[PDB]
Amino acid sequence: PPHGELQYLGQIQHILRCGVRKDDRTGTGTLSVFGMQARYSLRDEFPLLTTKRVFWKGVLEELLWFIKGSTNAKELGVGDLGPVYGFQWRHFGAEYRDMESDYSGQGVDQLQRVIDTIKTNPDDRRIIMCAWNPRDLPLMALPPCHALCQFYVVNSELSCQLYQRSGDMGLGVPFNIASYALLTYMIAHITGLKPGDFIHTLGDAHIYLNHIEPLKIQLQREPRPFPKLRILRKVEKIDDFKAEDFQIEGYNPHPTIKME
Amino acid sequence: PPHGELQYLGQIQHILRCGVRKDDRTGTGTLSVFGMQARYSLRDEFPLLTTKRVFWKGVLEELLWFIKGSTNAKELGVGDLGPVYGFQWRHFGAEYRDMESDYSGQGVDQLQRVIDTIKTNPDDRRIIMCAWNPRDLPLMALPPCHALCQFYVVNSELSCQLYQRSGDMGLGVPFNIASYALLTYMIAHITGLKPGDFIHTLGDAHIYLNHIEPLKIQLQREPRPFPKLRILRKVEKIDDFKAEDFQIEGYNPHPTIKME
Numbered sequence: 099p100p101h102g103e104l105q106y107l108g109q110i111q112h113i114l115r116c117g118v119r120k121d122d123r124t125g126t127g128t129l130s131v132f133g134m135q136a137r138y139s140l141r142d143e144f145p146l147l148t149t150k151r152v153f154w155k156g157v158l159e160e161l162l163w164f165i166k167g168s169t170n171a172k173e174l175g176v177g178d179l180g181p182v183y184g185f186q187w188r189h190f191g192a193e194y195r196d197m198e199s200d201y202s203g204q205g206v207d208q209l210q211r212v213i214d215t216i217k218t219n220p221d222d223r224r225i226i227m228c229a230w231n232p233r234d235l236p237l238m239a240l241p242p243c244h245a246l247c248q249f250y251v252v253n254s255e256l257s258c259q260l261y262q263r264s265g266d267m268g269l270g271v272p273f274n275i276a277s278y279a280l281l282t283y284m285i286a287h288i289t290g291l292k293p294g295d296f297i298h299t300l301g302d303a304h305i306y307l308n309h310i311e312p313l314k315i316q317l318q319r320e321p322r323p324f325p326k327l328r329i330l331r332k333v334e335k336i337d338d339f340k341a342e343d344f345q346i347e348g349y350n351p352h353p354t355i356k357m358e
Numbered sequence: 359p360p361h362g363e364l365q366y367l368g369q370i371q372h373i374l375r376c377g378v379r380k381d382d383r384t385g386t387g388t389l390s391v392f393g394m395q396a397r398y399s400l401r402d403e404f405p406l407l408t409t410k411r412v413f414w415k416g417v418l419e420e421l422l423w424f425i426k427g428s429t430n431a432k433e434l435g436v437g438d439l440g441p442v443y444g445f446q447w448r449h450f451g452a453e454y455r456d457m458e459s460d461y462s463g464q465g466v467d468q469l470q471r472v473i474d475t476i477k478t479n480p481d482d483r484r485i486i487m488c489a490w491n492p493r494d495l496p497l498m499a500l501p502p503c504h505a506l507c508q509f510y511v512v513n514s515e516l517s518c519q520l521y522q523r524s525g526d527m528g529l530g531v532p533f534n535i536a537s538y539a540l541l542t543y544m545i546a547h548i549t550g551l552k553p554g555d556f557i558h559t560l561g562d563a564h565i566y567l568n569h570i571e572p573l574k575i576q577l578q579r580e581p582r583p584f585p586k587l588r589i590l591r592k593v594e595k596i597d598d599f600k601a602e603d604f605q606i607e608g609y610n611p612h613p614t615i616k617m618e
Contacts, residue, residue, distance in 0.1 A: 118512045121481055132510040132517045133557035135395040190500060206500050221381055223524040223562050224494065226502035234484065240450060240466050242486035246506065248523055248561045250392040252378045257392045259561055261521050263508055264483040297393035299559050301508045301519055302483050 103147055103321035105136035106275075110267055110313050113305045120304070128304035134265075135300070138275060140286075140293030141255075144327035144346065145279050147272045149319040151351040157276045158341050165209065165284075165336060169197040183229045212249055213336060216289045220251035247278065249285070255294030256286040264302040268309035268357045274298070280327070280344075287329055288336055309357045316355055325349035363407055363581035365396035366535075370527055370573050373565045380564070388564035394525075395560070398535060400546075400553030401515075404587035404606065405539050407532045409579040411611040417536045418601050425469065425544075425596060429457040443489045472509055473596060476549045480511035507538065509545070515554030516546040524562040528569035528617045534558070540587070540604075547589055548596055569617045576615055585609035 109131075117129030138145035146152050156176035163174040167188030171177035178197045185194065185201075192205030208227040215225050228243035235241060242263065250257045260278045265271050279296045286293045305313060326347040333339055369391075377389030398405035406412050416436035423434040427448030431437035438457045445454065445461075452465030468487040475485050488503035495501060502523065510517045520538045525531050539556045546553045565573060586607040593599055 120512050122483075123481075130512060132512075132555065133395070133397055133519050133559075135393070135559060137393055221383075223382075224502050226523065228502075242484050242488075246521070250562060252380050252390060252392075259393050261506070261559065263486065295392065299393075299395060299521065302510060 101321040102136075102138045102145055102324065103149060105138075106147060106271070107149065107317055107321070109134055109136065109303065110305070111317060113267060113303060114310065114314065117305065120302070122304070127307040129307070129310070130302050130304040132302055133300070134303040136298050138279065138296045138298070140257075140279060140282060140296055142326065143324040144276075144283070145296060146276050146325055146327075146346065146349060146351075148322045148324065148349075148351045149316050150272070150355040151353060152272050152276055154276065154346055154349070157273060157280060158344060161277050161280055161284075162339065162341060165339070167201065169194070180232065181230075181235055182232050186230055187227060209336060213285060213289060216249065216251060216256070216285065216291070223250075225249040225251075247281070249282075250294075251291060252294075254291055256282060256289065256291040257294040257297065258282040258285075259297040259299060261299045262301065264304065265298075265300040267303055267305050268313055269306075271298070271300075271303075283327055283329065284333075284336060284339055287333060306358070312355050312357055319352045322350045322352075323348070361581040362396075362398045362405055362584065363409060365398075366407060366531070367409065367577055367581070369394055369396065369563065370565070371577060373527060373563060374570065374574065377565065380562070382564070387567040389567070389570070390562050390564040392562055393560070394563040396558050398539065398556045398558070400517075400539060400542060400556055402586065403584040404536075404543070405556060406536050406585055406587075406606065406609060406611075408582045408584065408609075408611045409576050410532070410615040411613060412532050412536055414536065414606055414609070417533060417540060418604060421537050421540055421544075422599065422601060425599070427461065429454070440492065441490075441495055442492050446490055447487060469596060473545060473549060476509065476511060476516070476545065476551070483510075485509040485511075507541070509542075510554075511551060512554075514551055516542060516549065516551040517554040517557065518542040518545075519557040519559060521559045522561065524564065525558075525560040527563055527565050528573055529566075531558070531560075531563075543587055543589065544593075544596060544599055547593060566618070572615050572617055579612045582610045582612075583608070 113129050113131050117131050120130040159176050164184040167184040169179045169185050187209045189201045190206035190208050212227050215222050227247045229245045231244040245262045248259045283293050328345045330343050373389050373391050377391050380390040419436050424444040427444040429439045429445050447469045449461045450466035450468050472487050475482050487507045489505045491504040505522045508519045543553050588605045590603050
């Protein structure tokens with residue numbers, strides 16, 4: 099039964115060997131492969147990658163920030179931004195005044211809707227929440243999402259598939275694996291389900307040119323067993339979670355790699 | 359270099375062996391796996407599956423119908439429906455009167471937008487068109503799409519990833535592989551690119567209980583080389599394509615299997 103992180107490492111190795119040169123928005127070079135997918139078990143372990151130390155404290159704090167629906171840059175330590183992955187998760191489509199305003203009952207609450215659907219119809223094939231890159235929002239009518247998150251329930255287990263239209267394999271991907279796995283753990287918890295799988299799918303999976311040498315070194319590292327994630331308290335509403343409620347156990351990573 | 363159809367067949371075999379019982383909307387039973395992906399080359403071949411005869415005539419005619427943006431059931435042979443995968447592809451968000459009405463310049467033209475972005479910025483990570491199941495549209499505010507299609511360009515090749523939130527593996531999937539491969543061929547053609555890969559990703563990948571025995575028989579069949587798809591004329595606008603313009607060559611399928 100091979101370690102899940104071997105998928106991530108093989109994807110890296112695949113982009114290095116077979117990726118094509120392609121520029122991003124800013125004209126910065128990448129090696130790119132289109133279409134990738136990996137599956138991480140959430141059953142009695144937590145996919146916090148071990149071939150480098152992943153910034154767990156930042157993962158947790160930024161997810162809790164997003165769950166608050168905040169547009170206050172200063173509320174997050176790891177300023178009116180307008181809409182961001184929080185305002186869209188909790189107040190989807192509501193007309194935005196300022197970050198201090200009262201948005202209660204305004205717009206679609208995509209996150210509460212996912213949780214309520216899990217509890218009203220676990221078979222539903224439509225348990226879907228999307229996030230937008232803020233910069234796309236004024237660019238065009240009906241802009242595409244950056245990321246779509248689909249949940250799935252069978253046998254009292256909650257799985258999650260995250261589809262991102264692009265994925266920065268060196269910096270963003272390890273961080274997003276941990277972030278959506280954590281979201282799945284929180285949702286499973288409040289809905290009385292057990293976490294099942296996290297599945298990560300990408301469109302443009304890329305490695306920035308300046309990350310090649312650090313990733314080549316990362317690839318020489320053998321994964322250690324994944325840690326465990328324990329929630330320390332019985333928590334009722336998704337808004338009630340605090341950073342204090344979570345303990346990562348048995349995390350034995352290789353050293354930090356700075357990318358970038 | 360294994361035949362691409364071996365992916366489809368292994369996915370079938372995987373759901374039969376490892377799928378969990380799960381009911382659909384109507385309470386009809388399936389075996390289900392969450393999260394799957396396969397990649398089909400579009401380079402000098404066309405992924406029209408060969409372990410059964412796929413209804414190519416219907417694939418082509420229904421795609422041409424969708425591209426017209428029609429809501430006239432009778433215009434398709436393989437009645438005012440309101441919004442359907444055509445009205446959303448061509449007139450996304452426009453207020454719908456009746457099927458005979460003039461919708462020119464009304465709503466977002468997702469399909470023309472994809473084509474125009476390919477030609478104005480081939481590096482764009484946002485070349486995305488979505489489709490909705492008509493029945494979801496009045497159910498809630500901001501309903502989830504049924505399917506998201508992302509295009510990708512590198513080295514003068516056009517690839518396409520289709521993510522569907524659920525996929526009926528026996529009936530719908532072979533048909534959708536051919537449909538999006540064909541769309542990729544048409545778009546590649548008008549943008550002066552070569553088709554690259556079609557990547558098919560699913561959320562709830564399922565086999566209806568009544569399809570088990572026919573699929574078990576299908577699995578005993580060896581794939582033949584894929585056919586070729588030739589476009590017979592130089593075509594300029596996506597609206598100009600006619601069924602007459604397309605010829606499938608070298609298609610040598612095993613017999614039709616009726617599912618259901």
